[model samples]
Target: ERSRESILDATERLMATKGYAATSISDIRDACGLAPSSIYWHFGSKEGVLAAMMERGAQRFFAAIPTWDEAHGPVEQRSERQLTELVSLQSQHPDFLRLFYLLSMERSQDPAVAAVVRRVRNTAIARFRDSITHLLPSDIPPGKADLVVAELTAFAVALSDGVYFAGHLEPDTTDVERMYRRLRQALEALIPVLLEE
Candidate 1:
């Protein structure tokens, strides 16, 4: 299992930068100092390795998001803490999505990889749905809460994807702080108004 993780970590770094198609078995061996034979022994093929990496990365990423159920505060404060935690999480796990987006760019040619990335994204978005819904007013009925949370989660994740893309194209820049601040603002500003209608 140690060798398994080493291969995944090396592949993640290489694929995130050099891209999946560009990375080779030799590259994994070079990066991790493990033999190409070992990779196949564990994962069967490079795509197998990719599928495993995505699953592991998705688990780590989702586990890091705050559940917010234990948070004691006004909705605004809870939202603030939620975004604060999210900002920190992204800083650490930037490559998780980087690999997802990079590989997703070519997913049409790879169905198994496509299925893994698609499941990761939908499951990822659903986790955010759970996170954002935690910040919603507790008095709203569960059925309508689901409705409003679905809408809010979509909007929030769309904005987050923009932030993800901008970070991708721009690399390290001041755009991150400002983009994410507005995200929190939009979320906190709108969360209170969901039940008005």
Candidate 2:
């Protein structure tokens, strides 16, 4: 049986270089110097490996979210923490970031991949939206927090896609900070309303 590290390293390298569709179980086997069955023993299938990678990426993002900051706090502080965590996650896992970009660009053509991607995204947005709902003031009327959260989330996904494009297509840093600053402005505008003070 191949180790988890071996499988992940092999899969990450192949997927990062050749993308999901271009890369295959054979490629992973060749890279890891393992039999095809060995790869299956560890990952079950190619999609299983990819899904594991996505889960790892999610954990990295989630772990970086709050750091030492406690959960209960000002709306702006919480939102900034989330943003900072996302930035840190992308900075650390450049390959994963690239993989995300590739998947976003390719999902339209691959229904299976698109389904997995949407499932992950929708789950994430719901989790974040629920948390946001809890943090907002009580007087803000029903559903307002949910609406704001959903909108910000949709916009954030778009913004992250834009960032992924900037890194993947242009691969330039000149506009990176400007792009992040724009997100800051976006959150700032919505965060104050959530605070209601």
Candidate 3:
């Protein structure tokens, strides 16, 4: 069991830093100080290891997201709080995000790996959309609220990705903490505009 955990840790570190195609079972074995057979014993194959990695990453990611009940407050306050919590979590788990992006962008040929990625990604998007819908002001009609929530959720995802990329590429120059503060300010402004429409 300890060896299995070690294998997973090494695989995540290697696969997150190196693209999936470039990382081999041998590489993981070397990093974990284990034999090839040991890895095979723990996980059936390379794809199996990746599937487990994705599952772990998804669990961590979802665990970090604040529940809707926990996000109680004024709409602006609640949204800002939730977004801030999310950005902080992402920053702390860049490896997981990197691995996710690397596998997802590769047009992953492995059905199992692709299925895990798609399921997690879809769940994340739907959760974001649902949160925004739940917080939509009472004045806005259902139709307009739906449109606003959809667009805003998409925009938030894009902005968060941009912040993540910038932080990774220019860590010294980019202040992700500051960027998130500005994100809250923008959201505060956006709510009024959305309500007016």
Candidate 4:
């Protein structure tokens, strides 16, 4: 009747593998073996389940993020550690990450579900902007710092999409480490230049 834990587990399990388009309600039913009434009864609508998944994923993500002030070492060191942690995050939270990435790829199945993507992206990006600003030099003015960091954060997020696209295009040859290292180098190159101009 009320098996949210089991239902969500099954939801992630199914959707992560096959993605939103391929995995139907019937698929979730098949995966979980719960009556549709019992399952939907627990989570309300499909959007309810969608938002719940996205929310938990975002929380876990930021909770593990590097606290800016307390972060140690040179900029390269900090950036390396950031991606190093990210590798573990991808492994540890594969289901949620995969689910979100897949949803982002195909677009959502419906409107409320679509809203979940927009809402979650905005929420997560705001948090991302915070962490990214931490990377900037203090010589820059706060007003200008905010502007550059926001622009850089947009590029960073789009790079994330590109990385995911690479892996999606070919999972085996698409080494995530190489991509993140390239990203770090790209950021290193741009940060000073952008902040200067």
Kindly list the per-residue Cα lDDT of model 4 for residues 1-197, writing each as its tens digit.
34676677777777658965577777788877888887677667776776666666666776776655445776554655666776556434344556666666674355655666676788667755766776787788999998888888888888876776677667777877778778777877889888778
lDDT by residue for model 1 (1-197), tens: 78989999999889768987799999999999999898998988888888888889888876666666744566555756766767776655467787788777872546657778888889868767867776677788999888888888888889988887777776667466677888767877887677675
In model 2, what lDDT does residue 160 have? 68
Task: Give the TM-scores of the predictions, in the order they appear.
Answer: 0.77, 0.67, 0.75, 0.72
lDDT against the true structure, per candidate, is 0.79, 0.65, 0.77, 0.70
- Tally clashes: model 2: 0
**What range of 10 consecutive residues in model 2 has the weakest lDDT sum?**
107-116
The sequence of per-residue lDDT tens digits that candidate 3 reaches over residues 1-197 is 68877888898788658967799999998899999988887767899788887778788787778767777766554656777788788667466777677677886358778888888777778777766776566888888888888878887667777887887888778878788778657765787687777
TM-score of candidate 1 to 2 decimals? 0.77
Q: What alpha-carbon RMSD in Å does predicted model 1 have with respect to the real structure? A: 3.3
Off by over 4 Å in 3: 1-7, 13-44, 71-76, 192-197
Worst 10 residues of 4 by lDDT: 87-96
For candidate 4, what is the total of clashing residue pairs?
A: 0
* Best candidate, TM-score: 1
What's the lDDT for residue 158 in model 1? 90
Global fold similarity of model 3 (TM-score): 0.75
Better of 1 and 4 by TM-score: 1
